[PDB]
């Protein structure tokens, strides 16, 4: 017999919206991003690694304190938060005053998908 | 200033296709499903948990041998493999002879999205 196939459309966005809920409730967040003001951001190591390798570099270079990765000086919540939110939604939420800094941050991470978006 | 927003369309499928590549290369696979013939299936614990809680129940009930979860008798590769592939793609690939068993398995997991698909 021949193998048949049926699908469920809009599964990508549906699956993505599920991971956003987990990110909102800090469910199964293995990676803890810790900023300069001791504020934390619980994320999924899989979601970030699927969008860039920059966070994988930080884990081998930056210091770790009690399961919390210390973010470098140029990589704080002003740029990290809206970029991570983009990974979970596909939407970049930002103020116009943050444009240049987000662009330079995107170049630093070499996040191509975010580079093209900012350079429309 | 007002917060602005730009987006990248088809991000859901794009992000989903990234996780499929990781699943193909066994990259960052934390959960190891071990079948009766000692065959293994490397999966992501996040992807499965986002589609059902059934695998979370197996981790608290079924035995674990060297980071490998022992699958129950009714839950083997004949049904597990095509169902997991659905989670990563949104497409259920199967033979017609497996229809009834996949349906009963879906009822057992209470995977609603797969139930409606099979009961079109």
Numbering used by the authors:
A (entry chain A), B (entry chain A): 2 to 121
The authors write:
The Drosophila melanogaster centrosome associated protein at 190 kDa (CP190) was first identified as a MAP using MT affinity chromatography. CP190 is a large multi-domain protein that has a distinct localization pattern that is tightly coordinated with the cell cycle. During interphase it is restricted to the nucleus where it serves as a key component of chromatin insulator complexes that spatially organize the genome. Upon nuclear envelope breakdown, a population of CP190 redistributes to the centrosomes and the spindle.
To gain structural insight into the conserved CP190 BTB domain, we purified and crystallized native and selenometionine-substituted BTB (residues 1–135). Crystals belong to the space group P3221 and contain one CP190 BTB molecule in the asymmetric unit. The structure was built and refined to 2.5 Å resolution, yielding R and Rfree values of 21.9 and 25.9, respectively. The final model contains residues 2–121. The BTB domain forms a homodimer across a crystallographic 2-fold axis, adopting a canonical homodimeric structure as found in the BTB-ZF subfamily of BTB domains. Each chain in the homodimer has an α-helical core composed of six helices, α1- α6, flanked by a four stranded β-sheet (β3-β2-β5-β4) and a two-stranded inter-molecular β-sheet formed by β6 and β1' from the homodimeric mate. Key dimer contacts are made at this hydrophobic interface as well as a reciprocal N-terminal β-strand exchange in which β1 extends along the base of the homodimeric mate, forming a two-stranded antiparallel β-sheet with β6'. Along the homodimer’s two-fold axis, α1 makes key hydrophobic interactions with α1' from the homodimeric mate. We analyzed the oligomeric state of the BTB domain using SEC-MALS. We conclude the highly conserved L20 residue is critical to support homodimerization.
